[PDB]
């Protein structure tokens, strides 16, 4: 998994985030994505992310190409390039007038399969959201950003399940909750969760049973999947395999068109 810095030319910065930076690059002639992790003095966040990535192999998970370690201290994670950017942007840019129901459901299934794979390998993503899902040149959505990925045990409040923010342990059921939130993002075309509520009301409102409204023009069946992800009693939430089956049941009867 070791790469050579001399063969990597950092072209431009694709995004400067709070926990890391991502840059478009050229490695041995091919476009590639290069990530560095912030606030990681001992480099253990870097190690943890790289390691887990060497263990993931699914067609809907952004693929690790290798690692670059300069003795000076520059630590990078080289990843396959995803030409279409985050799913959030892709949705916002092209929007309702371009993305049909099939496209939206197809994205949901893509993410869902990635998640079923993670659950099947005993991993919890803890950071599933439309922003952390990228789209390739030929429209395949793939989950990315595995920084917080660990086996069955800070978290983005608007995407994290109640028990997760409160309990010290995370589980696939919280991931399922996040999937619910993500779907809402998908059928909302990138809109931000809990639109007309203060970030300081979310958890208390949610725990008081609040649930976002089905997006505009959202298929009732799709919304019921979301809702099913939002049950307050985690154990009652569906399995990712059960989510795939139901999204497939929806597709099979065209309940989304």
């Amino acid at each position: 998994w070791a790469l050579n810095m001399k063969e990597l030319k950092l072209l431009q910065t694709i995004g400067k985030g709070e926990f890391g930076d991502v840059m478009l690059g050229d490695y041995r002639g091919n476009k590639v994505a290069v990530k560095c992790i912030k606030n990681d003095a001992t480099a253990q966040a870097f190690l943890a992310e790289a390691s887990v990535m060497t263990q993931l192999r699914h067609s809907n998970l952004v693929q690790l190409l290798g690692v670059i370690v300069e003795e000076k201290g520059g630590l990078y994670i080289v990843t396959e390039y995803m030409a279409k950017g985050s799913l959030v942007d892709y949705l916002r840019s092209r929007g309702r007038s371009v993305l049909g129901g099939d496209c939206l459901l197809k994205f949901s299934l893509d993410v869902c399969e990635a998640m079923e794979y993670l659950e099947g390998n005993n991993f919890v993503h803890r950071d599933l959201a439309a922003r952390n899902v990228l789209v390739s040149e030929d429209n395949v959505a793939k989950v990315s950003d595995f920084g917080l990925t660990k086996e069955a045990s800070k978290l983005p409040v608007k995407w994290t399940a109640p028990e997760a923010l409160r309990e010290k342990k995370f589980s696939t059921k919280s991931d399922v909750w996040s999937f619910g939130i993500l779907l809402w993002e998908i059928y909302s075309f990138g809109r931000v969760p809990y639109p007309r509520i203060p970030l300081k009301d979310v958890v208390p409102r949610v725990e008081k049973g609040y649930k976002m409204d089905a997006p505009d023009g959202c298929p009732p069946a799709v919304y019921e999947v979301m809702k099913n992800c939002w049950h307050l009693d985690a154990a009652m939430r569906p399995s990712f395999l059960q989510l795939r089956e139901q999204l497939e049941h929806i597709k099979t009867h065209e309940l989304h068109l």
């Binding site: 942007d89 916002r92 840019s93 092209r94 929007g95 309702r96 007038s97 075309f189 990138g190 809109r191 931000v192 809990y194 639109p195 007309r196 509520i197 203060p198 970030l199 300081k200």
Partner: protein, 258 residues
């Protein structure tokens, strides 16, 4: 003609709002009551078919934030009668006495309305082609309705290659965000057009105006993306501006000006 068609004695041209090259515009009365704007064509400038295109469209398009056509008079002299907007252009209003009292909550709200209209425009596969504050109208309760050579407000691809699209409209929206946020000012201050074309081409972009929260500027830069397929939709724009003070800046305190 249509039963959009009225007798030209029901109209009552009262106060002259303004003028211009393509006829003038008046406040007034239609039938008994009803306030009305009354646009007219000068027999001299453009033909009947020319100044009765913005009725071909203004008939089909009904939306809360597009200024609504009420009724025409087709056989010249021409009179397009529409709804009255009683604080004049966005520019005057903002740029005039009330202008100085507006703060960010108010300007952001106006902008959310404009986008609500440009999102109805959007849905119908229409294209505005000259979206700027001067072409927005204002009314009671700070309401703002869309309706009716500006290189500085126009997207590169349109300014040069003549590709107007709803995404090239989004570009102007972002320029229009500078208008709301500095309360009337021409974009790219102390630049002539050749610099604006020059510099946007080399990648320049209007900075963040005085006291303008940085979440606003980001969304101007989102409107000013080189590649037009990436600029966000009026539907994204609209929602962002609707939720601004809860989701984006819920810890905003009023300053000197915004």
């Amino acid at each position: 003609k249509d039963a959009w068609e009225i007798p030209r004695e029901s109209l009552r041209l009262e106060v002259k709002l303004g003028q211009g090259c393509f006829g003038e515009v008046w406040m007034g009365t239609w039938n008994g009551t009803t306030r009305v704007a009354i646009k007219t064509l000068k027999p001299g400038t453009m033909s009947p078919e020319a100044f009765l295109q913005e009725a071909q469209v203004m008939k089909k398009l009904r939306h809360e934030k597009l200024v609504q056509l009420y009724a025409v008079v087709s056989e010249e002299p021409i009179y397009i009668v529409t709804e009255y907007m009683s604080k004049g252009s966005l520019l005057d209003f903002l740029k005039g006495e009330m202008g100085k009292y507006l703060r960010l909550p108010q300007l952001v709200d106006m902008a959310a309305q404009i986008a609500s209209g440009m999102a109805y425009v959007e849905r119908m596969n229409y294209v505005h082609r000259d979206l700027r504050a001067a072409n927005i109208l204002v009314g009671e309760n700070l309401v703002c309705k869309v309706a009716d050579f500006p290189i500085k407000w126009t997207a590169p691809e349109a300014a040069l290659y003549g590709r107007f699209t709803i995404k090239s409209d989004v570009w102007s929206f972002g320029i229009l965000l500078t208008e709301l946020t500095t309360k009337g000012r021409v974009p790219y201050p102390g630049m002539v057009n050749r610099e604006v074309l020059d510099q946007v081409e080399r990648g320049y972009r209007m900075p963040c105006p005085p006291e303008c929260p940085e979440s606003l500027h980001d969304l101007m830069c989102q409107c000013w993306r080189k590649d037009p397929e990436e600029r966000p939709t009026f539907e994204y724009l609209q929602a962002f501006l609707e939720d601004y003070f809860t989701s984006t800046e819920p810890q905003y305190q009023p300053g000197e000006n915004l």
